[PDB]
């Protein structure tokens, strides 16, 4: 558009902030301001416009932005993903019979889980995805460890903090990790490209 200035909305999923800047101003300004105002570290965020990462020196003019366009502030995730998860769109029917229900004894006493063993096709390292039968809670910890082979402990800690701050986890005294309801598990599954696997795990017999 012919306007000299532009209103832009930045959203991180939890909060939205509107900014008015001159179209010749580098977007560095807007990104740093969003991070500062939200009390987040710049290194923990990635800013996208129409699915493309924004570079700090790019201006709204450079990108041909329009008034009230939206910038998405995505959280950082580990750089590499399990090649098992290179297609989020596959139908999950064949994965359901791979799931298994298992009764585990605790001091008070038994609890039923559903699990799905997921093997990295390149390294052959396996991880289990885990579901609690009673409320269909899913271990977000199990999802993250399966999704990101080279994740550091710092990256895992950052992600579990994000889950606590943005989704609706529970703690079970009995079992470690962060457990989330089905809707939250499916939101994470999209983020981790694990949708068919979490679909299967959620539908499987307990």
């Amino acid at each position: 558009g012919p306007e000299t200035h532009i209103n832009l909305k930045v959203s991180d999923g939890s909060s939205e902030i509107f900014f008015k800047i001159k179209k010749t101003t580098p977007l560095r300004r807007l990104m740093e301001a969003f991070a500062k105002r939200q009390g987040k570290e710049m290194d923990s965020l990635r800013f996208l416009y129409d699915g493309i990462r924004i570079e700090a020196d790019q201006t709204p003019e450079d990108l041909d932005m329009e008034d009230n366009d939206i910038i998405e502030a995505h959280r950082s995730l580990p750089a590499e993903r399990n090649p098992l998860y290179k297609d989020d769109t596959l139908d999950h029917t064949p994965l359901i019979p791979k799931c298994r229900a298992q009764v585990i004894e605790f001091p008070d006493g038994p609890a039923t889980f559903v699990r799905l063993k997921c093997t990295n096709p390149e390294s052959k390292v396996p991880h289990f995805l885990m579901r609690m039968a009673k409320d269909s809670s899913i271990s977000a910890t199990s999802m993250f460890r399966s999704a990101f082979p080279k994740a550091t402990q710092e990256e895992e800690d950052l992600e579990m903090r994000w889950i606590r701050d943005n989704l609706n986890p529970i703690e079970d005294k009995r079992v470690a990790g962060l457990w989330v309801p089905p809707a939250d598990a499916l939101a994470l599954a999209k983020d981790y490209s694990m949708t068919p696997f979490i679909n299967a795990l959620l539908e499987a017999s307990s």
């Binding site: 298994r100 585990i104 889980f113 063993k117 289990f128 009995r174 079992v175």
Partner: peptide, 17 residues
């Protein structure tokens, strides 16, 4: 077979408390 090991494996990882 592998099923039993998977069962034992899984119980082990769940109880990683």
């Amino acid at each position: 077979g592998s099923a039993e090991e998977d069962d034992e494996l899984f119980q082990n990882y769940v109880l990683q408390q």
